[PDB]
Design an enzyme around this catalytic site. Sequence first.
Site, mmCIF file in Angstrom:
data_model
loop_
_atom_site.group_PDB
_atom_site.id
_atom_site.type_symbol
_atom_site.label_atom_id
_atom_site.label_comp_id
_atom_site.label_asym_id
_atom_site.label_seq_id
_atom_site.Cartn_x
_atom_site.Cartn_y
_atom_site.Cartn_z
ATOM 1 N N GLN C 11 -116.359 97.185 0.634
ATOM 2 C CA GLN C 11 -115.990 98.579 0.442
ATOM 3 C C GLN C 11 -114.808 98.752 -0.498
ATOM 4 O OE1 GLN C 11 -113.374 100.903 2.001
ATOM 5 N NE2 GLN C 11 -114.388 102.437 0.714
ATOM 6 N N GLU C 61 -121.875 98.224 4.713
ATOM 7 C CA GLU C 61 -121.827 99.610 5.159
ATOM 8 C C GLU C 61 -122.274 100.519 4.022
ATOM 9 O OE1 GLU C 61 -117.911 100.146 6.572
ATOM 10 O OE2 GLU C 61 -116.918 99.715 4.667
ATOM 11 N N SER C 130 -112.585 92.830 -1.428
ATOM 12 C CA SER C 130 -111.471 92.964 -0.511
ATOM 13 C C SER C 130 -111.787 92.227 0.783
ATOM 14 C CB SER C 130 -111.178 94.436 -0.237
ATOM 15 O OG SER C 130 -112.095 94.976 0.699
ATOM 16 N N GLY C 134 -115.259 92.321 6.981
ATOM 17 C CA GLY C 134 -116.234 91.266 7.175
ATOM 18 C C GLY C 134 -117.141 91.053 5.981
ATOM 19 N N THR C 135 -117.585 92.134 5.336
ATOM 20 C CA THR C 135 -118.439 91.979 4.163
ATOM 21 C C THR C 135 -117.678 91.324 3.016
ATOM 22 O OG1 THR C 135 -119.829 93.161 2.557
ATOM 23 C CG2 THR C 135 -117.995 94.413 3.544
ATOM 24 N N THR C 169 -105.307 97.576 7.524
ATOM 25 C CA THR C 169 -106.342 98.503 7.960
ATOM 26 C C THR C 169 -107.243 97.876 9.015
ATOM 27 O OG1 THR C 169 -107.984 97.865 6.308
ATOM 28 C CG2 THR C 169 -106.306 99.445 5.638
ATOM 29 N N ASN C 196 -101.407 95.325 -1.711
ATOM 30 C CA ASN C 196 -101.335 96.784 -1.701
ATOM 31 C C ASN C 196 -99.929 97.334 -1.881
ATOM 32 O OD1 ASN C 196 -104.122 97.086 -1.329
ATOM 33 N ND2 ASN C 196 -103.933 96.841 0.892
ATOM 34 N N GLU C 244 -110.303 80.343 -23.522
ATOM 35 C CA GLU C 244 -108.914 79.949 -23.730
ATOM 36 C C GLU C 244 -108.027 80.359 -22.568
ATOM 37 O OE1 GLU C 244 -108.092 81.776 -27.537
ATOM 38 O OE2 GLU C 244 -107.985 79.815 -28.515
HETATM 39 N N1 LIG Z 1 -107.642 98.369 -3.890
HETATM 40 C C1 LIG Z 1 -108.551 98.896 -3.075
HETATM 41 N N2 LIG Z 1 -108.752 98.339 -1.828
HETATM 42 C C2 LIG Z 1 -109.674 98.865 -0.989
HETATM 43 C C3 LIG Z 1 -110.427 99.965 -1.374
HETATM 44 N N3 LIG Z 1 -111.256 100.277 -0.354
HETATM 45 C C4 LIG Z 1 -111.051 99.399 0.654
HETATM 46 N N4 LIG Z 1 -110.065 98.525 0.281
HETATM 47 C C5 LIG Z 1 -109.531 97.403 1.075
HETATM 48 O O1 LIG Z 1 -110.585 96.716 1.718
HETATM 49 C C6 LIG Z 1 -110.141 96.248 2.973
HETATM 50 C C7 LIG Z 1 -111.328 95.994 3.893
HETATM 51 O O2 LIG Z 1 -112.275 95.270 3.140
HETATM 52 P P1 LIG Z 1 -113.859 95.512 3.280
HETATM 53 O O3 LIG Z 1 -114.629 94.214 3.215
HETATM 54 O O4 LIG Z 1 -114.295 96.431 2.166
HETATM 55 O O5 LIG Z 1 -114.041 96.246 4.703
HETATM 56 P P2 LIG Z 1 -115.515 96.669 5.192
HETATM 57 O O6 LIG Z 1 -116.351 97.143 4.031
HETATM 58 O O7 LIG Z 1 -115.422 97.721 6.271
HETATM 59 O O8 LIG Z 1 -116.141 95.311 5.787
HETATM 60 P P3 LIG Z 1 -116.804 95.243 7.251
HETATM 61 O O9 LIG Z 1 -115.698 95.108 8.266
HETATM 62 O O10 LIG Z 1 -117.709 94.042 7.337
HETATM 63 O O11 LIG Z 1 -117.615 96.491 7.507
HETATM 64 C C8 LIG Z 1 -109.178 97.311 3.461
HETATM 65 O O12 LIG Z 1 -108.152 96.726 4.226
HETATM 66 C C9 LIG Z 1 -108.616 97.904 2.184
HETATM 67 O O13 LIG Z 1 -107.303 97.441 1.975
HETATM 68 C C10 LIG Z 1 -110.232 100.530 -2.627
HETATM 69 O O14 LIG Z 1 -110.892 101.508 -2.975
HETATM 70 N N5 LIG Z 1 -109.289 99.991 -3.477
HETATM 71 MG MG LIG Z 2 -117.934 97.085 5.506
#
Ligand SMILES: Nc1nc2c(ncn2[C@@H]2O[C@H](COP(=O)(O)OP(=O)(O)OP(=O)(O)O)[C@@H](O)[C@H]2O)c(=O)[nH]1
Ligand SMILES: [Mg+2]
Lengths: 71, 131, 429, 420, 420, 67
Positions: C11, C61, C130, C134-135, C169, C196, C244
């Site tokens: 995400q 998701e 990120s 989990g993903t 988060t 962040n 390079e």
């Molecule tokens: N820089 C930046 N970070 C983001 C953004 N959206 C989410 N994140 C980061 O992504 C982290 C979570 O990673 P994800 O793998 O995307 O979380 P998820 O998609 O809910 O994964 P699942 O738990 O498996 O459902 C959060 O703690 C955020 O800090 C974004 O738009 N920009």
């Molecule tokens: Mg997710």
Amino acid sequence: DKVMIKFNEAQSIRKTYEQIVKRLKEERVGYDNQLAAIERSLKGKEHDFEELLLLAHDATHAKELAAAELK
Amino acid sequence: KPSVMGQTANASKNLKKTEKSSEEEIMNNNISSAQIKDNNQSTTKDNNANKKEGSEGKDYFTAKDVAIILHDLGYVATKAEIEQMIWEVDENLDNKVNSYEFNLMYRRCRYDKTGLEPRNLYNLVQFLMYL
Amino acid sequence: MREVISIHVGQGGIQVGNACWELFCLEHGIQPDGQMPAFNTFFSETGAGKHVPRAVFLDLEPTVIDEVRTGTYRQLFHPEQLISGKEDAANNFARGHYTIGKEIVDLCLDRIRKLADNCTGLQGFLVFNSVGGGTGSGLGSLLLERLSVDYGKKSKLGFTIYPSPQVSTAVVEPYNSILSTHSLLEHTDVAVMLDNEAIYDICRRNLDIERPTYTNLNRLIAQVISSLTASLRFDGALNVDITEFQTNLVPYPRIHFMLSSYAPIISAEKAYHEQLSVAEITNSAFEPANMMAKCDPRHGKYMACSMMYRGDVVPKDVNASIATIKTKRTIQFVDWCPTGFKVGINYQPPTVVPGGDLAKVMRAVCMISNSTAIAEVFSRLDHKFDLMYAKRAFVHWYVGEGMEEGEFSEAREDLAALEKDYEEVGIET
Amino acid sequence: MREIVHIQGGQCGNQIGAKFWEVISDEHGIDPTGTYHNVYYNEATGGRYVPRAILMDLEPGTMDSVRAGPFGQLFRPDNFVFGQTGAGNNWAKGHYTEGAELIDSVLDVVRKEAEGCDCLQGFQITHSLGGGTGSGMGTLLISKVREEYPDRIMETFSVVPSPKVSDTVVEPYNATLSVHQLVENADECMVIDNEALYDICFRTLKLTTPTYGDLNHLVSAAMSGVTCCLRFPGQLNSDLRKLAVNLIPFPRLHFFMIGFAPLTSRGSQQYRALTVPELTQQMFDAKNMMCAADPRHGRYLTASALFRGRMSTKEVDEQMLNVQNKNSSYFVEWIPNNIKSSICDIPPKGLKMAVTFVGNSTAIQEMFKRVAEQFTAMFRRKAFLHWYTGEGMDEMEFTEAESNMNDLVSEYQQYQDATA
Amino acid sequence: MREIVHIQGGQCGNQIGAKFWEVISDEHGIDPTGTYHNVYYNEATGGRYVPRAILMDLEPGTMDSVRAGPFGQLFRPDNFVFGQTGAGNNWAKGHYTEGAELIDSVLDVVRKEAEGCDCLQGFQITHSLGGGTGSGMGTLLISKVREEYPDRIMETFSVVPSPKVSDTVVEPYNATLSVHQLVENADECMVIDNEALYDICFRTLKLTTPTYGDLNHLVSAAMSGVTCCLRFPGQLNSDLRKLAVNLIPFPRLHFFMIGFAPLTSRGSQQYRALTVPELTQQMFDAKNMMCAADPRHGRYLTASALFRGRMSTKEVDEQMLNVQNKNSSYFVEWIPNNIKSSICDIPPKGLKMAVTFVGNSTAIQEMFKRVAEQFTAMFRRKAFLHWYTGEGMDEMEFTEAESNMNDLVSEYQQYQDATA
Amino acid sequence: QKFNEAIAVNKQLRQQIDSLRRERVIFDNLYKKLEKELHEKRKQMANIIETANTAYEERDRANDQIQ
Ligand SMILES: Nc1nc2c(ncn2[C@@H]2O[C@H](COP(=O)(O)OP(=O)(O)OP(=O)(O)O)[C@@H](O)[C@H]2O)c(=O)[nH]1
Ligand SMILES: [Mg+2]
Ligand SMILES: Nc1nc2c(ncn2[C@@H]2O[C@H](COP(=O)(O)OP(=O)(O)O)[C@@H](O)[C@H]2O)c(=O)[nH]1
Ligand SMILES: Nc1nc2c(ncn2[C@@H]2O[C@H](COP(=O)(O)OP(=O)(O)O)[C@@H](O)[C@H]2O)c(=O)[nH]1
């Protein structure tokens, strides 16, 4: 009672079968990797043969001109 | 104890796999594992497998031989189900049982992590080695 | 010739990629229509003379996924590059790498399979995961694994977003991050880290906007990435090579986790009142307040540094700024690298997005550096991981998904091996 | 998608489910007639949206009363599992003689509603622990659905015996009998109590003439806010399983206290500002909980927060950072960053913001111990027993239920202070 | 074309035929007056369509009653074969003394209606097995038409003695006497029983005040749906002989159970969706049959399905594939692809879809055995015999009828489990 | 009712799984055919130094004659 026993048994059997299936899947991936590698290594073979063709040709072409002069 | 033994190994496996599930409830790969699996003096198993099953002796083993061995064991030879016993472990060519396939199956089922692979064909190999 | 592929998995990565492409179109002149009223690297041919990006937005998701497929940017992406799951990975690594990963991995591999077949001259990959979720942890790890076992020879630049230093988060961040670091080592040939806190400070006290949000953050990352890819997109004075980049910023394959920086980040309200000279920008360049990640410039001894100049830049101001930064004591380099500076000039100024806080200026510079400070982020992640692992927390969430317990520890001392090497390589003789 | 099925139980659960469906219809723009003027609803020819909501109970007067009130056409005429005798405030009645003959009507209808979907991510039960029907019948449904579907996540919005008085004389017996069969097969027990609900509708809200429909509306707004992060977009979305992971570090300490915000006086609704720091003040204020257990008399094993409305993420970051900064030892420190945060991108009906706080903490153990205390009192001295013992139950199970409650609480308390 | 002739028998068959003609008139847009506002009707000067429907019976009160009700002008005044004495619940009465003097009036009229057509592909009989007239008279007509016309296909919508009670005291005698003369000369016996018909109009349809005209309407809608694939277009059409082939693999096991769909509650007719997966659920549901024999207590020798309405063929393919996939051993596996499927291209009056399932299975053998059991009981102990024996019948024929029934069922059962 | 559903799900899973099992079996038969084919290409690799050596010994002879 015998119904439930055999049902749990069939459950165990299916779990077994999906275990075997995922194992066969991972070994299929391993086959894919080894195959790709070996195919590249054997492309090297065709290239090495192709180059030695030209090498042999050059080594003969120099001798052909050498023959007339040394005589 | 000819039939009751194939039933023992069966029921023991039935309990063994329940406990295997309990373990998770509480808390070239093929060849790379084959080479390391048990390398005991399997001349007993080879000579015995040919002596009891291998009739012609050309790296080839069919369902008729297993059916006649089953019938000679005083066992009720199920006319067509023995085919599944021949097939369950056949992995290269359907209706091809080589001595090398005996090695692969025997070995993968003898030395492994869990088992459960057929649990049902090499029980006969276990029986012939048993007696 | 040069084509570059970007996965935006998770995400975080998917929104970063949304902003990436929303900025790429406005920079190259592409409208969101897919219509345009060079672009070789990012934009392909459809036989009708219009462009579809060479990138895939992947996420368990599906929320942000239908957001992008029924938003305003639908006309750009191909329906073949948007695959959705119906569940998540529960923020744990095992549900994204072991259970739900396997049925999406082959579909993504077939899509990028055909996409690498589509473009001719692939030069590198960019994984956007990120790891906090989990993903972005497990599925991104598995994606990078498969990318490296299929492609291998090609470079991979991961813009992975770690669990933040103290903000979070999610609580189970320490587990599913240390476990992704294992695959992050081998697969992500070079890994430009993200966190962040530093972009929060930048957006708050650098653009003077008082609430920084994720859309602004992703736009800003997209601007940094535009400064990164301008060299290959448009013609420059002394063009640099992305291979390079590796041969100059990877002194050893053990030290390839690198950080970044950008200048200038200024509002128009101070851009109208500042001079912003070529030599002046090179100071805020290595400014520790300007730093993009949780790294301390004086913590690490710089082993390699690449500077990305774009706009109206003349080489001798660059060369004299290098001299002044190498003269003053506040910076230092590793002794084994007597010269660890590589610069790249580009005659393309940064393009402007309508509705952005960012200001148009003549000169822009982007720093990307292989140093030894990142080990502090490493140990700081290890802090939370050990504090959670010492007490059995969320262990069931991981083991009930086809995962063994020892992988926690093997990943912990895996990242500890990085911490060790990162201080063993940067000492005196 | 990521479905929910809404099974009910007891008159309590029936009223709460009725008002929850009222709230979700009034939020999704669904009339009492069932049109739009699928994550919760089902398609029906003629342009109708039927809630896949099952109402089971041992008495039909509750059934009739929930049909009679507004929004009654929502529920279709099959999911009214009719009981004719009533368990009559007896766990044995509601769990053994009438359970073991209602199980299967409920099984057919829940298989109905479950095959109706593609992916049933989670369940939904609202019932009691004290009423014979509600308690026994409900925990039995939980056991059955957890028997066939081991991959879903179980969730009960459970009302417990009230502190100052017991609503029915055998509240302790029925409550320990419900928790003893709740711990292992219920994955998230949102603990609510009528008295704390009274307190929250009384203190800061001027409500001087309350009603059961009013408390139902309150807890249903909370019940909608806990999951509203699912069916709507958002910059940082979650689910039932990211929540479950970030909430339980152990499969046992998975009972949660809940609160929802904002809730202020109406005559004073203009004098105050309305901001996210004020939201944090509002619910990290002790009194805003919906359980008779002030959590600051214990410790927070962990806590999750779910926002509603579009503001920045700088917010939630400084939010859980500030709150951890001062009420640190009010939490537990053996776990890093024990506060999880997510954002739903849509504000409530007519207002600006919404916030839902859920907490896996160790202050409900005293609730459990007070239940077990009342139980043991009436239990040794044999108070109100033949109602349970003349219907195929023995006090060996009562002893084990009591001891199991005590075991749960002993882990709760030692995990409160476990540090390394 | 591909004609039908509608001969009736008994008061049962007379009422069912009356309502079936009512249904087909209301479907083809035919008034009770006989106009349009030929596969079933005949042309008559003045612009009239006369049904070639013969009503034979040994009593005229039934004749008068079927004339009196609506849609009575359909039947022309010659096909009222009038009997004056009545067999009085006696197979001997209805088959020998009054048969052998009504045969030939019926012969003249059936030759009338048969020469009236060009190609008479199939017959049509609706009668009883228990009533003296219906049973004896009807099986005698069957024997006679199968004597002269060996190339047609015979078909009886036959009602059997009811399980819980016998409608007439000699139901067993008359029933075995009807089946003994049914097996060899009747090609498709659709087995119906009044009690299962009651069950299907009671359970899922809210009908609390039923009537014989109502059951007639139900079974006549089914009777129209079995053949509606003939007179109408369709992507994949069939007939009486493709059906007969795909249904009987042996000339003996040719007795069929039938069901028709859709049939749901009316107050709940809006809450439910309406789809083809729901049609499959509806009738592969056990309870939707029209015979007192749940077919899942036996095996399906084969089964045919006939659709009505225009949807895809992907449907019927996944339909019989899915149903074979789970209820495989509920069928018989010794025969490949034992489910046949066809499509009629027109939906019912006012609705969206119709489905007719017909089944050649081995669960009516128990019906046959219960008939033979009641027979043998009254038979050895000689109950109710002189009514049959003082009218030129001997119990040698009773013995052979009983034994023949038993022979039929012995093949049924062994073909249930025959595998290779 | 529980028994009938149990048998239904067991049949479904068993057939579904065995189909894919045989598919992976064929995928391994692919290793069977290739390992032999690429071993033949390795026998062709054995035409390196042999034929490169035709070149090299011919080079000995040729260049020796030149010198
Ligand atoms: N820089 C930046 N970070 C983001 C953004 N959206 C989410 N994140 C980061 O992504 C982290 C979570 O990673 P994800 O793998 O995307 O979380 P998820 O998609 O809910 O994964 P699942 O738990 O498996 O459902 C959060 O703690 C955020 O800090 C974004 O738009 N920009
Ligand atoms: Mg997710
Ligand atoms: N929140 C709420 N609780 C209720 C309501 N009605 C009853 N209760 C509570 O539910 C409990 C009764 O349990 P229940 O299972 O419904 O009783 P039973 O049906 O006779 O077994 C009592 O302790 C009440 O405090 C209501 O409308 N709202
Ligand atoms: N479905 C149906 N069955 C009927 C009706 N009337 C009578 N029956 C059945 O038909 C049987 C009577 O047979 P029948 O031959 O008509 O009697 P008979 O004329 O005196 O010989 C009884 O067992 C009834 O159950 C009706 O209107 N509908």
